[PDB]
């Protein structure tokens, strides 16, 4: 997965 | 906005992952659709300047600049609310605004940490993200102003964000 498409602070609910 | 993610990474504590994905970022910056040619250049200059340093040396400069002081803090509400109790409610209201968009904190950073806030903005539709930058634009401009006083190229990232705001 592309780096800029990986979350660094959040996650989905 | 991919640009908001890109600045969010560049405005964070310089992580080693920046060096190993510089190619991906350089290309994303180059193919940017939201930044005029001259600003994408300035951003690519910034990344190249950053990743030609050793990360240990990038990390040290970053701390000398953002972690030693309050005037250059990346916690937004430290620039908005003088009373500590006002900051608290602001953070709660920001956390809830994140929860409204189906986003949950998965970090050990505060909700008004600018890089984190930029990650949130990047998840929004174009207009929704642009309003977000307009909301913090006086903060962006103060920080840029202060960084320029210390003759630091991180100011570039604030000017770019201000540009993206208009």
PDB file of C-alpha atoms in Angstrom:
ATOM      1  CA  UNK A   1       0.000   0.000   0.000  1.00  0.00           C
ATOM      2  CA  UNK A   2       1.226   3.461  -0.958  1.00  0.00           C
ATOM      3  CA  UNK A   3       2.737   5.402   1.955  1.00  0.00           C
ATOM      4  CA  UNK A   4       0.557   8.521   1.575  1.00  0.00           C
ATOM      5  CA  UNK A   5      -2.540   6.301   1.605  1.00  0.00           C
ATOM      6  CA  UNK A   6      -1.660   4.856   5.046  1.00  0.00           C
ATOM      7  CA  UNK A   7      -3.164   6.611   8.064  1.00  0.00           C
ATOM      8  CA  UNK A   8      -0.707   7.849  10.667  1.00  0.00           C
ATOM      9  CA  UNK A   9      -3.088   9.285  13.306  1.00  0.00           C
ATOM     10  CA  UNK A  10      -6.622   7.965  12.737  1.00  0.00           C
ATOM     11  CA  UNK A  11      -8.653   4.815  12.231  1.00  0.00           C
ATOM     12  CA  UNK A  12     -12.164   4.179  10.949  1.00  0.00           C
ATOM     13  CA  UNK A  13     -15.193   3.485  13.125  1.00  0.00           C
TER      14      UNK A  13
ATOM     15  CA  UNK B   1      -6.149  16.423  -0.681  1.00  0.00           C
ATOM     16  CA  UNK B   2      -2.934  14.448  -1.170  1.00  0.00           C
ATOM     17  CA  UNK B   3      -1.121  17.753  -0.586  1.00  0.00           C
ATOM     18  CA  UNK B   4      -2.526  17.912   2.961  1.00  0.00           C
ATOM     19  CA  UNK B   5      -1.254  14.399   3.742  1.00  0.00           C
ATOM     20  CA  UNK B   6       2.134  15.286   2.238  1.00  0.00           C
ATOM     21  CA  UNK B   7       2.486  18.416   4.362  1.00  0.00           C
ATOM     22  CA  UNK B   8       1.166  16.502   7.383  1.00  0.00           C
ATOM     23  CA  UNK B   9       4.070  14.050   7.020  1.00  0.00           C
ATOM     24  CA  UNK B  10       6.627  16.829   6.413  1.00  0.00           C
ATOM     25  CA  UNK B  11       5.364  18.847   9.349  1.00  0.00           C
ATOM     26  CA  UNK B  12       5.609  15.854  11.689  1.00  0.00           C
ATOM     27  CA  UNK B  13       8.756  14.835  13.614  1.00  0.00           C
ATOM     28  CA  UNK B  14      10.963  13.655  10.741  1.00  0.00           C
ATOM     29  CA  UNK B  15      10.394   9.938  10.569  1.00  0.00           C
ATOM     30  CA  UNK B  16      12.752   7.435   8.936  1.00  0.00           C
ATOM     31  CA  UNK B  17       9.826   6.330   6.749  1.00  0.00           C
ATOM     32  CA  UNK B  18      10.176   9.713   5.007  1.00  0.00           C
ATOM     33  CA  UNK B  19      13.573   8.713   3.647  1.00  0.00           C
ATOM     34  CA  UNK B  20      12.463   5.368   2.353  1.00  0.00           C
ATOM     35  CA  UNK B  21       9.360   6.719   0.604  1.00  0.00           C
ATOM     36  CA  UNK B  22      10.921   9.924  -0.742  1.00  0.00           C
ATOM     37  CA  UNK B  23      10.463   8.652  -4.295  1.00  0.00           C
ATOM     38  CA  UNK B  24       6.694   8.234  -3.829  1.00  0.00           C
ATOM     39  CA  UNK B  25       6.415  11.716  -2.289  1.00  0.00           C
ATOM     40  CA  UNK B  26       8.597  13.462  -4.892  1.00  0.00           C
ATOM     41  CA  UNK B  27       6.332  12.064  -7.604  1.00  0.00           C
ATOM     42  CA  UNK B  28       3.105  12.970  -5.781  1.00  0.00           C
ATOM     43  CA  UNK B  29       4.419  16.505  -5.240  1.00  0.00           C
ATOM     44  CA  UNK B  30       5.439  16.667  -8.905  1.00  0.00           C
ATOM     45  CA  UNK B  31       2.026  15.554 -10.168  1.00  0.00           C
ATOM     46  CA  UNK B  32       0.174  17.885  -7.750  1.00  0.00           C
ATOM     47  CA  UNK B  33      -3.072  19.342  -9.136  1.00  0.00           C
ATOM     48  CA  UNK B  34      -3.800  21.702  -6.216  1.00  0.00           C
ATOM     49  CA  UNK B  35      -0.521  23.658  -6.117  1.00  0.00           C
ATOM     50  CA  UNK B  36       0.906  25.989  -8.796  1.00  0.00           C
ATOM     51  CA  UNK B  37       4.156  24.870 -10.360  1.00  0.00           C
ATOM     52  CA  UNK B  38       6.280  27.198  -8.231  1.00  0.00           C
ATOM     53  CA  UNK B  39       4.848  25.998  -4.914  1.00  0.00           C
ATOM     54  CA  UNK B  40       5.165  22.311  -5.793  1.00  0.00           C
ATOM     55  CA  UNK B  41       8.787  23.116  -6.616  1.00  0.00           C
ATOM     56  CA  UNK B  42       9.263  24.798  -3.220  1.00  0.00           C
ATOM     57  CA  UNK B  43       7.744  21.746  -1.531  1.00  0.00           C
ATOM     58  CA  UNK B  44       9.995  19.379  -3.464  1.00  0.00           C
ATOM     59  CA  UNK B  45      12.990  21.529  -2.548  1.00  0.00           C
ATOM     60  CA  UNK B  46      11.913  21.161   1.077  1.00  0.00           C
ATOM     61  CA  UNK B  47      11.666  17.366   0.923  1.00  0.00           C
ATOM     62  CA  UNK B  48      15.041  17.090  -0.825  1.00  0.00           C
ATOM     63  CA  UNK B  49      16.658  19.364   1.740  1.00  0.00           C
ATOM     64  CA  UNK B  50      15.131  17.292   4.497  1.00  0.00           C
ATOM     65  CA  UNK B  51      16.099  13.841   3.249  1.00  0.00           C
ATOM     66  CA  UNK B  52      19.669  14.748   2.390  1.00  0.00           C
ATOM     67  CA  UNK B  53      20.224  15.182   6.123  1.00  0.00           C
ATOM     68  CA  UNK B  54      20.645  12.154   8.323  1.00  0.00           C
ATOM     69  CA  UNK B  55      17.282  11.575  10.104  1.00  0.00           C
ATOM     70  CA  UNK B  56      19.022  11.894  13.461  1.00  0.00           C
ATOM     71  CA  UNK B  57      20.187  15.341  12.399  1.00  0.00           C
ATOM     72  CA  UNK B  58      16.790  16.236  10.933  1.00  0.00           C
ATOM     73  CA  UNK B  59      15.131  15.089  14.169  1.00  0.00           C
ATOM     74  CA  UNK B  60      17.469  17.237  16.265  1.00  0.00           C
ATOM     75  CA  UNK B  61      16.750  20.405  14.277  1.00  0.00           C
ATOM     76  CA  UNK B  62      13.009  19.688  14.409  1.00  0.00           C
ATOM     77  CA  UNK B  63      13.071  19.461  18.205  1.00  0.00           C
ATOM     78  CA  UNK B  64      15.200  22.588  18.588  1.00  0.00           C
ATOM     79  CA  UNK B  65      12.390  24.329  16.710  1.00  0.00           C
ATOM     80  CA  UNK B  66       8.997  22.848  17.653  1.00  0.00           C
ATOM     81  CA  UNK B  67       9.482  20.972  20.969  1.00  0.00           C
ATOM     82  CA  UNK B  68      11.506  23.721  22.728  1.00  0.00           C
ATOM     83  CA  UNK B  69       8.990  26.510  23.220  1.00  0.00           C
ATOM     84  CA  UNK B  70       5.350  27.541  23.129  1.00  0.00           C
ATOM     85  CA  UNK B  71       5.398  30.195  20.411  1.00  0.00           C
ATOM     86  CA  UNK B  72       6.209  27.517  17.796  1.00  0.00           C
ATOM     87  CA  UNK B  73       3.855  24.864  19.151  1.00  0.00           C
ATOM     88  CA  UNK B  74       1.846  22.714  16.725  1.00  0.00           C
ATOM     89  CA  UNK B  75      -1.049  22.374  19.195  1.00  0.00           C
ATOM     90  CA  UNK B  76      -3.543  24.796  17.605  1.00  0.00           C
ATOM     91  CA  UNK B  77      -5.549  25.554  20.731  1.00  0.00           C
ATOM     92  CA  UNK B  78      -2.364  26.692  22.428  1.00  0.00           C
ATOM     93  CA  UNK B  79      -2.610  29.651  20.065  1.00  0.00           C
ATOM     94  CA  UNK B  80      -6.399  30.096  20.350  1.00  0.00           C
ATOM     95  CA  UNK B  81      -7.340  29.755  24.029  1.00  0.00           C
ATOM     96  CA  UNK B  82      -5.341  31.331  26.818  1.00  0.00           C
ATOM     97  CA  UNK B  83      -7.171  29.581  29.671  1.00  0.00           C
ATOM     98  CA  UNK B  84      -6.343  25.892  30.062  1.00  0.00           C
ATOM     99  CA  UNK B  85     -10.036  25.065  30.679  1.00  0.00           C
ATOM    100  CA  UNK B  86     -11.081  26.690  27.386  1.00  0.00           C
ATOM    101  CA  UNK B  87      -8.555  24.518  25.560  1.00  0.00           C
ATOM    102  CA  UNK B  88     -10.104  21.433  27.115  1.00  0.00           C
ATOM    103  CA  UNK B  89     -13.597  22.035  25.766  1.00  0.00           C
ATOM    104  CA  UNK B  90     -12.140  22.995  22.387  1.00  0.00           C
ATOM    105  CA  UNK B  91     -10.290  19.645  22.249  1.00  0.00           C
ATOM    106  CA  UNK B  92     -13.473  17.756  23.165  1.00  0.00           C
ATOM    107  CA  UNK B  93     -15.442  19.591  20.498  1.00  0.00           C
ATOM    108  CA  UNK B  94     -12.698  18.810  17.964  1.00  0.00           C
ATOM    109  CA  UNK B  95     -12.678  15.127  18.978  1.00  0.00           C
ATOM    110  CA  UNK B  96     -16.447  14.998  18.438  1.00  0.00           C
ATOM    111  CA  UNK B  97     -16.115  16.656  15.022  1.00  0.00           C
ATOM    112  CA  UNK B  98     -13.690  13.819  14.166  1.00  0.00           C
ATOM    113  CA  UNK B  99     -16.163  11.223  15.456  1.00  0.00           C
ATOM    114  CA  UNK B 100     -18.901  12.834  13.333  1.00  0.00           C
ATOM    115  CA  UNK B 101     -16.861  12.042  10.193  1.00  0.00           C
ATOM    116  CA  UNK B 102     -16.428   8.447  11.384  1.00  0.00           C
ATOM    117  CA  UNK B 103     -12.811   8.987  12.451  1.00  0.00           C
ATOM    118  CA  UNK B 104     -11.403   7.786  15.756  1.00  0.00           C
ATOM    119  CA  UNK B 105      -8.104   8.806  17.328  1.00  0.00           C
ATOM    120  CA  UNK B 106      -5.566   6.008  16.848  1.00  0.00           C
ATOM    121  CA  UNK B 107      -2.554   7.951  18.105  1.00  0.00           C
ATOM    122  CA  UNK B 108      -1.058   9.351  21.285  1.00  0.00           C
ATOM    123  CA  UNK B 109      -1.229  12.917  19.941  1.00  0.00           C
ATOM    124  CA  UNK B 110      -3.731  15.557  20.958  1.00  0.00           C
ATOM    125  CA  UNK B 111      -6.681  16.358  18.654  1.00  0.00           C
ATOM    126  CA  UNK B 112      -5.435  19.871  17.781  1.00  0.00           C
ATOM    127  CA  UNK B 113      -1.955  18.676  16.808  1.00  0.00           C
ATOM    128  CA  UNK B 114      -1.638  20.400  13.412  1.00  0.00           C
ATOM    129  CA  UNK B 115      -0.197  17.425  11.440  1.00  0.00           C
ATOM    130  CA  UNK B 116      -2.994  15.249  12.813  1.00  0.00           C
ATOM    131  CA  UNK B 117      -5.563  17.931  12.028  1.00  0.00           C
ATOM    132  CA  UNK B 118      -4.187  18.059   8.470  1.00  0.00           C
ATOM    133  CA  UNK B 119      -4.735  14.290   8.146  1.00  0.00           C
ATOM    134  CA  UNK B 120      -8.371  14.899   9.101  1.00  0.00           C
ATOM    135  CA  UNK B 121      -8.723  17.709   6.551  1.00  0.00           C
ATOM    136  CA  UNK B 122      -7.262  15.507   3.802  1.00  0.00           C
ATOM    137  CA  UNK B 123     -10.150  13.047   4.335  1.00  0.00           C
ATOM    138  CA  UNK B 124     -12.686  15.699   3.513  1.00  0.00           C
ATOM    139  CA  UNK B 125     -14.104  16.803   0.182  1.00  0.00           C
ATOM    140  CA  UNK B 126     -12.054  19.560  -1.451  1.00  0.00           C
ATOM    141  CA  UNK B 127     -14.221  22.445  -0.237  1.00  0.00           C
ATOM    142  CA  UNK B 128     -14.554  20.956   3.251  1.00  0.00           C
ATOM    143  CA  UNK B 129     -10.766  20.674   3.556  1.00  0.00           C
ATOM    144  CA  UNK B 130     -10.274  24.223   2.224  1.00  0.00           C
ATOM    145  CA  UNK B 131     -12.611  25.711   4.825  1.00  0.00           C
ATOM    146  CA  UNK B 132     -10.620  23.873   7.509  1.00  0.00           C
ATOM    147  CA  UNK B 133      -7.444  25.639   6.410  1.00  0.00           C
ATOM    148  CA  UNK B 134      -9.321  28.950   6.346  1.00  0.00           C
ATOM    149  CA  UNK B 135     -10.419  28.237   9.931  1.00  0.00           C
ATOM    150  CA  UNK B 136      -6.828  28.008  11.184  1.00  0.00           C
ATOM    151  CA  UNK B 137      -5.309  30.469   8.689  1.00  0.00           C
ATOM    152  CA  UNK B 138      -4.414  33.112  11.346  1.00  0.00           C
ATOM    153  CA  UNK B 139      -2.516  30.378  13.172  1.00  0.00           C
ATOM    154  CA  UNK B 140      -0.833  29.228   9.972  1.00  0.00           C
ATOM    155  CA  UNK B 141       0.279  32.817   9.328  1.00  0.00           C
ATOM    156  CA  UNK B 142       1.613  33.405  12.837  1.00  0.00           C
ATOM    157  CA  UNK B 143       3.625  30.188  12.728  1.00  0.00           C
ATOM    158  CA  UNK B 144       4.980  30.969   9.271  1.00  0.00           C
ATOM    159  CA  UNK B 145       5.816  34.477  10.488  1.00  0.00           C
ATOM    160  CA  UNK B 146       7.657  33.107  13.543  1.00  0.00           C
ATOM    161  CA  UNK B 147       9.526  30.458  11.581  1.00  0.00           C
ATOM    162  CA  UNK B 148      10.684  33.158   9.138  1.00  0.00           C
ATOM    163  CA  UNK B 149      12.018  35.132  12.108  1.00  0.00           C
ATOM    164  CA  UNK B 150      14.099  32.088  13.074  1.00  0.00           C
ATOM    165  CA  UNK B 151      15.077  31.830   9.363  1.00  0.00           C
ATOM    166  CA  UNK B 152      13.681  28.281   9.130  1.00  0.00           C
ATOM    167  CA  UNK B 153      12.513  26.647   5.905  1.00  0.00           C
ATOM    168  CA  UNK B 154       9.653  24.931   7.756  1.00  0.00           C
ATOM    169  CA  UNK B 155       7.895  28.308   7.172  1.00  0.00           C
ATOM    170  CA  UNK B 156       7.576  27.110   3.585  1.00  0.00           C
ATOM    171  CA  UNK B 157       5.110  24.471   4.708  1.00  0.00           C
ATOM    172  CA  UNK B 158       2.940  27.063   6.402  1.00  0.00           C
ATOM    173  CA  UNK B 159       2.929  29.378   3.378  1.00  0.00           C
ATOM    174  CA  UNK B 160       1.944  26.437   1.169  1.00  0.00           C
ATOM    175  CA  UNK B 161      -0.937  25.631   3.549  1.00  0.00           C
ATOM    176  CA  UNK B 162      -1.997  29.277   3.536  1.00  0.00           C
ATOM    177  CA  UNK B 163      -1.823  29.188  -0.256  1.00  0.00           C
ATOM    178  CA  UNK B 164      -4.011  26.075  -0.333  1.00  0.00           C
ATOM    179  CA  UNK B 165      -6.454  28.046   1.855  1.00  0.00           C
ATOM    180  CA  UNK B 166      -7.350  30.596  -0.904  1.00  0.00           C
TER     181      UNK B 166
END
